[PDB]
Design a protein around this ligand. Structure first.
Ligand SMILES: [Mg+2]
Ligand SMILES: [Mg+2]
Ligand SMILES: [Mg+2]
Ligand SMILES: [Mg+2]
Ligand SMILES: [Mg+2]
Ligand SMILES: [Mg+2]
Ligand SMILES: [Mg+2]
Ligand SMILES: [Mg+2]
Ligand SMILES: [Mg+2]
Ligand SMILES: [Mg+2]
Ligand SMILES: [Mg+2]
Ligand SMILES: [Mg+2]
Ligand SMILES: [Mg+2]
Ligand SMILES: [Mg+2]
Ligand SMILES: [Mg+2]
Ligand SMILES: [Mg+2]
Ligand SMILES: [Mg+2]
Ligand SMILES: [Mg+2]
Ligand SMILES: [Mg+2]
Ligand SMILES: [Mg+2]
Ligand SMILES: [Mg+2]
Ligand SMILES: [Mg+2]
Ligand SMILES: [Mg+2]
Ligand SMILES: [Mg+2]
Ligand SMILES: [Mg+2]
Ligand SMILES: [Mg+2]
Ligand SMILES: [Mg+2]
Ligand SMILES: [Mg+2]
Ligand SMILES: [Mg+2]
Ligand SMILES: [Mg+2]
Ligand SMILES: [Mg+2]
Ligand SMILES: [Mg+2]
Ligand SMILES: [Mg+2]
Ligand SMILES: [Mg+2]
Ligand SMILES: [Mg+2]
Ligand SMILES: [Mg+2]
Lengths: 43, 89, 273
RNA sequence: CUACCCUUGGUCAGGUUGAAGUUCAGGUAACACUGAAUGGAGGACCGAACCGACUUACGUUGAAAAGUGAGCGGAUGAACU
RNA sequence: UGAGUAGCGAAAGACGGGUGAGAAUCCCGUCCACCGAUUGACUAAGGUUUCCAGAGGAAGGCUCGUCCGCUCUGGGUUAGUCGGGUCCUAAGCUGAGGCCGACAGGCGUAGGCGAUGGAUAACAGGUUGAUAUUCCUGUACCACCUAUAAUCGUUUUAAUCGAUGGGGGGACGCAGUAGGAUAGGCGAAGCGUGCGAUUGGAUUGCACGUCUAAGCAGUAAGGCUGAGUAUUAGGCAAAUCCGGUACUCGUUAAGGCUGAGCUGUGAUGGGGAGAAGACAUUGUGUCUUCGAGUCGUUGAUUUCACACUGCCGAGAAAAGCCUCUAGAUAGAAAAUAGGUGCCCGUACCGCAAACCGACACAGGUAGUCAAGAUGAGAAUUCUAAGGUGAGCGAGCGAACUCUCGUUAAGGAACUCGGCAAAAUGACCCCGUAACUUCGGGAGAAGGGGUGCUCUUUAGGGUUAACGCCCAGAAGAGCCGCAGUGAAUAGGCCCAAGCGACUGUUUAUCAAAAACACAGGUCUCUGCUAAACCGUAAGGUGAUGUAUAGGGGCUGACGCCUGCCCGGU
């Protein structure tokens, strides 16, 4: 049975990567939240 | 800057076989190119360099106790001499 | 004109098609082609705003001279060609100075015939003239609404309109729809009727052929659910079950007029269809 | 993941049937028309790959949070990827 | 607690010899078995060190463990030419100014980014524990640079460069056969190399091999195509280029453009079934010399080639490339010699124990290659190349459950229902109903044949012939219970309801009579169309224009579709 997660480096980066997050006001809010919480991984 | 381009020689079984073939292996600054390596070798060891092969080595996972980390990434060059020789010892 | 297939299969049974005898060249003029990617009825937001469009054969666009503004120079009909982007065929014509253009192919246009445009052109099929200069009673097609913009009216296969009379700044015309309306006499039109008259008779024959044409299936309102459509729901089959049939977006859709009021053209439209 | 779509690619062993058209012969005032050959159409036929999921047994603290065995449907197309 | 209970996840192992504290479980050997359109060989994603060597045995491993995808230690990935970047563009994304919008921001022009497509110069052999078109050997090619240059130019130029412009080209669908090649297969008393039987027999007997790239030079099955000269309302200016036009000659030819393949060379080199010399604490551990390459046959799903023919649904772009001028400037270079050529990836798994499934999980995972016998075949059964014996076993051979085989007489009496099972099944020949939209129904139905030996004998392909391959007909015989002797391969028929049909659907209890459908009809819509998305801008509709577009209903086809407009 084909499962939900089919990893793809390009898709992962282009959807959830640093530059995508930076390209939107709400993505920048995501980054700010994660920094505030002190996450090791922002993106 | 040649002394910064070349970091250290590599001494292994494969590297010793290469040295028998007149090929000398070095770890080099991760930012330099093949041409810079050739020029540094010629400047430092007063040899004539026939060619340079180069390759990158990923950081390797390494463990010590409960601490997980990585070794430094490496850039390794193999310099084939046209004229002369290099004595590492 | 029309070819009727033998019922070798239930798919072919009752199917018909054009024979394409009118077509004289089966490949287009390379330099008059442009790419035409499909929208599948989806707008600049990427959303489906018109249902039932999608898929279908790839097509190239043929640049077509609806304007016919190259006056006083004869052009010879090199060929009649198929065009996937419209019901009519198209005639590649070659002007005496060596410029080549596509035009809508009128009924009766033959390879080797000469066409011209301008106020001085003769009244013969394929010639383009201002309505000022076109006589009363003449059958025309490819009619402009604004001078120099290019033909917009009566371009489908078999389409034509008839010049009826000449007021001061406007000419009266009867359109294929039956509407009688005024059009500025500086607007141009092409003499004759659009060719490919048998287009409408073709029996498409099978679902797949519509799919090749890029038409996706139409699901009836009555077989949806209430949250989908005003006709949805009901146990078993149901009649319309309200005072008027409704569109999917909740507007009455049988007899309700939708032409907007206070339009500039309402004083130019003399008699509705 | 999934639905629909966009652009750009890929795949479909083997066998069968024999549409239109055409040619030859006959036939006609000329056409219809008849026969043979040619021709190679089809959401055409049988059937692997591939896609699917009709029946049934098994499984039901599973080998598997939807599967397996045996049969089953489509397989040049509104095909599958 | 349940309880020493359920379970230990598709399968074939046996023994000998090692190793070790300890061995069904590790190593080596022999035999046996399994896959082989593959359990084999590549490879894209994905993973990210899992790869290699040495060491270890706590934990992980459904048992064990001396072993491991585990633990420790140290190693391993080499490129001008392979894939990507220093080239191109598609969808899409982004977007200077700009348009729109309480804010946030949305839209969008020029311009950019963006492969799944276009362009683009390297091949064969050898080599390691682990990389190899990357290292080495041999032999190439591409771009650039420097020096010397046969020769040509030297300011309207005319040698040379040449647009950020023009033109050509790149450049394209689907189906269908036929043909030329080549790969591959097969045979041979061609050649070469081994072996020569002890179980009754034979010894022209048995087994194995029978090659070599790019590049360079030539050749050529096939495919396509008139050419030349004048002139010019066009190609934003120009044009000698393109387009148009006129004339001359030509037209089953010649010329031009393409083109698989072949030949030679590359190569007295390499590889090679093997042989002879050796060296070695025993040595399958390595060194030197030697070692054949033929003929026939078959023949692609590869290639010529989207070529050719046909068709309707009418089948990217841009760059590389060629050419034209506008412009540029004394200098240009056939050849010869020498030199320069970066970054990223490169390990390993990759129908899987390394990827997605929490697992060393009977699932899922694009593409490429894919031998012999049989056959129409990539089906079937058995094998090859190659890989594998499945990470609990030993006994016993109860009930019961599962999976499989058989069954007296009967033959649907079972049951909600023939559910399941059984039966049919290949090829050839005979033969085949109602009804029908004249296609069909049809493999209707129902029958007959099928092995082997020998004799006679019509043919076809390829060849001077021999030979090789394909393929019938007749007759006479032989054997069995049985000859598509295994495996794989329709059960059929008579009626009725529903839906015309091929399709589609409730991923995971419903596949249907439901949806769709081609056809019918009504209705809206004259173009800044109506309808639709959006606050708008901006879009879809449509680069369409009433033979068109949206919506409602009906649902192939045939015959038809009556009455009521009081109500809404
Ligand atoms: Mg590299
Ligand atoms: Mg519609
Ligand atoms: Mg419903
Ligand atoms: Mg409602
Ligand atoms: Mg209702
Ligand atoms: Mg009811
Ligand atoms: Mg079919
Ligand atoms: Mg489904
Ligand atoms: Mg199955
Ligand atoms: Mg069927
Ligand atoms: Mg089938
Ligand atoms: Mg016990
Ligand atoms: Mg108990
Ligand atoms: Mg028990
Ligand atoms: Mg037990
Ligand atoms: Mg097991
Ligand atoms: Mg290992
Ligand atoms: Mg254990
Ligand atoms: Mg701005
Ligand atoms: Mg690519
Ligand atoms: Mg390796
Ligand atoms: Mg004997
Ligand atoms: Mg590698
Ligand atoms: Mg590798
Ligand atoms: Mg698949
Ligand atoms: Mg098989
Ligand atoms: Mg019995
Ligand atoms: Mg009996
Ligand atoms: Mg009974
Ligand atoms: Mg009973
Ligand atoms: Mg049954
Ligand atoms: Mg049906
Ligand atoms: Mg379901
Ligand atoms: Mg079901
Ligand atoms: Mg209905
Ligand atoms: Mg009625």
């Amino acid at each position: 049975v084909k499962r939900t997660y089919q990893p793809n480096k390009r898709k992962h980066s282009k959807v959830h990567g640093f530059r995508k997050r930076m390209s939107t006001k709400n993505g920048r809010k995501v980054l700010a939240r994660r920094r505030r919480k002190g996450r090791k991984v922002l993106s | 800057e040649a002394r910064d381009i070349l970091k250290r020689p590599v001494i292994t079984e494969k590297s010793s076989e290469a040295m028998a073939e007149d090929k000398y292996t070095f770890d080099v600054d991760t930012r330099v190119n093949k041409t810079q390596v050739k020029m540094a070798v010629e400047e430092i060891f007063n040899v004539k360099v026939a060619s340079v092969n180069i390759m990158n080595y990923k950081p390797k996972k390494k463990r010590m106790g409960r601490y997980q980390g990585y070794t430094n990434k490496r850039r390794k060059a193999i310099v084939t001499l046209k004229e002369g020789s290099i004595d590492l010892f | 004109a029309i070819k009727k297939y033998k019922p070798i299969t239930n798919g072919r049974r009752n199917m018909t098609s054009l024979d394409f005898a009118e077509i004289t060249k089966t490949t287009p003029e390379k330099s008059l082609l442009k790419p035409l990617p499909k929208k599948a009825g989806r707008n600049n937001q990427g959303k489906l705003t018109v249902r039932h469009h999608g898929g279908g054969h790839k097509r190239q666009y043929r640049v077509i001279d609806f304007k016919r503004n190259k006056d006083g120079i004869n052009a010879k009909v090199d060929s009649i060609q198929y065009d996937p982007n419209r019901s009519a065929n198209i005639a590649l014509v070659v002007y005496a100075d060596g410029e080549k253009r596509y035009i809508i192919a009128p009924k009766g246009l033959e390879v080797g015939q000469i066409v011209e445009s301008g106020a001085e052109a003769d009244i013969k099929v394929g010639n383009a003239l201002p309505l000022q200069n076109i006589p009363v009673g003449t059958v025309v097609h490819n009619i402009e609404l604004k001078p120099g913009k290019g033909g917009q009216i009566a371009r489908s296969a078999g389409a034509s309109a008839q010049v009826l009379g000449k007021e001061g700044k406007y000419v009266l015309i009867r359109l294929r729809s039956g509407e009688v309306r005024m059009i500025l006499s500086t607007c141009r039109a092409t003499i004759g009727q659009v060719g490919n008259l048998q287009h409408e008779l073709v029996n498409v024959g099978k679902a797949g052929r519509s799919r090749w044409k890029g038409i996706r299936p139409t699901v009836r309102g009555s077989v949806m659910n209430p949250n989908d459509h005003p006709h949805g729901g009901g146990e078993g089959r149901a009649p319309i079950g309200r005072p008027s049939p409704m569109s999917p977006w909740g507007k009455p859709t049988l007899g309700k007029k939708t032409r907007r009021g206070k339009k500039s053209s309402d004083k130019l439209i003399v008699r509705g269809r």
